[PDB]
């Protein structure tokens, strides 16, 4: 009860980005300021893949092909024009004006995580916690 | 109950980015300021891959192909024009005006994590924590 | 119950970026200021890969192909035109106006992490923590 | 229950960036100021790889191919035109106007980490912490 | 239960960047100011690699191919036009106007780390901490 996954045959091209002819015959790329300018993209990762346990794997692409996952923090105004306090005492948290913003990215793939906490608490912990045990052929 | 994953045959090209003809025949690249300018991209990572335990692997691309995951901090105004305090005492946290911003990137892939905390707390911990145990052929 | 993953045959080209013809026949690259200017890119990492335990591996590309993950800190104004305090005492945290910004990059790949804390707390810890145990053929 | 991963055959070219013909026949590269100007890129790292435990490895590229992960600190204005204090006492943290910015890069690959703290706290620790134990054929 | 990963055959070229013909036939490189100007790049690190435990290794490229990971510190203005203090006492931290910026690079590869702290705290520690134990054939 084992396996033998294989037996593949191709006869034509394979991932051959043959850019021919007059196409692409004149590139005029200009950049200014920050940012980037490009000319063209031909991405053809053809592949021939075999395995006997494709476990939690990815065989094409994973993350982000054309995506604007851009992040911006607070833009408003925090005005604090007076807080008459006479005498606090042992005040662990008091009188705290907090204008806070928090952003996290897309959690893509196995066992990912995006945690975003904002405000005036969150004591007693934060963040991810992962215990991974991966064994090929093993316990 | 083992395995023998293989037996692959190709006859044509393989990942051969043969850029021929008049195409690409005139590149005019200009840059100014920061940032980058490029001419063209032909990326054809064709491949022939075999394994017997493709466990938590990636065989094509993973992260980011064309992506604007750019991050900007606070842009607003924090005005603090007075806080009449007479006498605090043992004030661990008091009177704290905090204009805070926090951003994190995309967590892509296995067991990644993006934690973003912002504000006036978060004592008693922060951040990720990972215990990985990977064993090929082993326990 | 072992293995023998192999048996690959190719007959054509293999990752041969044969840039021929009139294409690319005239490059005019100009740069100014900071930043970079390039001419063209032909990246064809074709490969022939075999293994018996592809565990948490990557066999193509991983990180960032064309990406603007650029980061900017605070841009707003922090105005503090008065805080009448008569007598604090043992004030561990008090009267703190804090305009803070924090950014982190994309956490790509296995067991990565991007932590971003900003504000007026975060005592008692920060940052990642990883205990890795990898054993080939071993416990 | 061992292994023998191999048996690869190629007949054509292999990673041979044969740039022929009139293409590339006239390069005019100019630079000014800082920054860089280049002419063209033909990167074809074709390879023939075998192993018996590809554990947490990378066999193509890893980090950053074309990426603007550039970082900028604070750009706003911190105005502090008065803080009438009569008598603090044992004030560990008080009266602190702090305009702070913090950026971190992309954490790419296994067990990486990007920590970015900014503000008015973070006592009692910071930064990463890693305990790695890797054993080939061993415990 | 050992191994014998091998058996590779090539017949054509191998990483031979044969730049022939009229292409590249006229280079005109000019530089001014700082920075660099180049002519062209043909990078074809073809390779034939075998192993029996490719553990936490990299076999192609790792770090940065074309990347603007450039860093800039603060650019804003820190104005401090008065702080009427009569008598502080034992003031470990007080009256501190701090305009601070901190940047870190991309943490690429195994067990890397980029820590960036900025502000008015961070006592009681900072920075990375790593305990590595690598043993070939050993405990």
Numbering used by the authors:
A (entry chain E), B (entry chain D), C (entry chain C), D (entry chain B), E (entry chain A): 276 to 414
Quote the authors verbatim.
Proteinaceous brain inclusions containing the transactive response DNA-binding protein of 43 kDa (TDP-43) are a pathological hallmark of amyotrophic lateral sclerosis (ALS) and frontotemporal lobar degeneration (FTLD). TDP-43 consists of an N-terminal domain, two RNA recognition motifs, and a C-terminal low-complexity domain (LCD) that maps to residues ~267–414 and is rich in Gln/Asn and Gly residues. Furthermore, recent reports indicate that these aggregates can self-propagate by the prion-like mechanism. Consistent with these findings, polypeptides corresponding to TDP-43 LCD or its fragments have been shown to form amyloid fibrils in vitro.
Here, we report the cryo-EM structure of amyloid formed from the entire TDP-43 low complexity domain in vitro at pH 4. Each twisted fibril consists of a single left-handed protofilament in which subunits stack along the fibril axis with a helical rise of 4.73 Å and a helical twist of −1.66°. A near-atomic-resolution structural model could be unambiguously built for the fibril core, which maps to residues 276–414 of TDP-43. The C-terminal region (residues 344–414, strands β9–β14) is characterized by a small proportion of hydrophobic amino acids. Relatively long β-strands pack mostly via polar interfaces and many residues within strands β9, β10, β11, and β13 are engaged in steric–zipper interactions. By contrast, the N-terminal region of LCD (residues 276–343, strands β1–β8) is rich in hydrophobic amino acids and contains mostly short β-strands that are not involved in steric–zipper interactions. Instead, strands and turns pack against each other in all directions, allowing non-polar side chains to be tightly packed and buried, with a hydrophobic interface between the 311–318 and 336–341 segments. The non-planar backbone conformation of TDP-43 LCD subunits (which is not unusual among amyloids) results in rugged surfaces of fibril ends with well-defined “ridges” and “grooves”. Mapping the pathogenic mutations on the structure of wild-type TDP-43 LCD fibrils revealed that ~50% of them are not compatible with this structure due to severe steric clashes within tightly packed segments of the protein, introduction of charges into the dehydrated fibril interior, or both.
